[PDB]
Amino acid sequence: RELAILATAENLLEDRPLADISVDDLAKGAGISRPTFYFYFPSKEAVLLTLLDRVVNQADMALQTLAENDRENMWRTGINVFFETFGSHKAVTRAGQAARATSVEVAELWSTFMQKWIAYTAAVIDAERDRGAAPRTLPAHELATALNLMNERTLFASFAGEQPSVPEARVLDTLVHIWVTSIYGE
Amino acid sequence: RELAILATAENLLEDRPLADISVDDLAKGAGISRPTFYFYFPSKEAVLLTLLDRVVNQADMALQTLAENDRENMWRTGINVFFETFGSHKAVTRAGQAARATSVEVAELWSTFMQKWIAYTAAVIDAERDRGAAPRTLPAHELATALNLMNERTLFASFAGEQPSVPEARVLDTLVHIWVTSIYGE
Ligand SMILES: [N-]=[N+]=Nc1ccc(C(=O)NCCC(F)(F)F)cc1
């Protein structure tokens, strides 16, 4: 019944925003009363927080699976965790990013996982540098930061079909070229 | 007295958000009545729209001034229009970007100037390609799109001191390295 509230919320986020979704909306959808809903979640806001948390941890688990196992393809594979994971959860992604402005727990969750993915990118760049494959150019953590923020903005513009945006079928190739040239280039 | 409302709004946006600023707040600040304010602007929302419009057109005019007059330094100079212009107007920038979610005129204004700056970046890349200085890699307009969205996200993260972000004193160098390597690199 927790799963039913979450699934009902993911569905309703595909045809309208959170503001236009009532607790009763979520209650009916999971086939429970308004008050029974409140036993599982304090708000519709915490329902989005739980969805976002699950999408983010799926991405994070998938990037850990890669880390335990050519260079252009290694970066493609890692960028593709975020493309596939968030691209399969477009409504949660769109509503997650919107809720950063108004929910401190959404902003902190997003902030924590971004710190973690930048720290991972920076360790990979330093490892490529230590073994002589990439040149010592920018500080690794500053380059990591900017490449991760590029992906956030560019992936989410594409998913939401913003103008402007890279077409979704061209965004992976676009990002991989920019990562690989800026990491290996002089 | 129009200038006085705008200046009062820019000032009050430095210590709190638009939501926490009343029409009376703006009225008092410009030394006029609430009703006299409404002769100049229909809302506090349209006051932000006019500020944003002026900041954006300053950036756009400054990038036109460059276009009418080494390669790493040409890109630095262009990226520096956005760093300096928006970095001198941090509160307007922060509140402009927030209002994209809730104002269709803010989103359309931002959308139009981004289309225009991407179209400019793409023409410069194609011009560099035609004269043999840059290789034919990604489609120019797709690379332009992603580099412009990188700058939006990275500049605004830095200005607002988000975690994570590039430190403000390192963000220009960071972006120029990523533009130059991805535009000229193989
Ligand atoms: N291998 N390698 N490691 C990688 C590869 C790609 C990313 C990334 O694409 N981050 C973007 C994060 C998000 F904003 F959520 F999209 C991070 C680490």
Ligand SMILES: [N-]=[N+]=Nc1ccc(C(=O)NCCC(F)(F)F)cc1
């Ligand atoms: N020469 N050259 N041309 C250029 C150079 C830099 C930009 C840019 O930095 N765009 C970012 C636009 C904003 F998001 F507003 F920051 C655009 C065109």
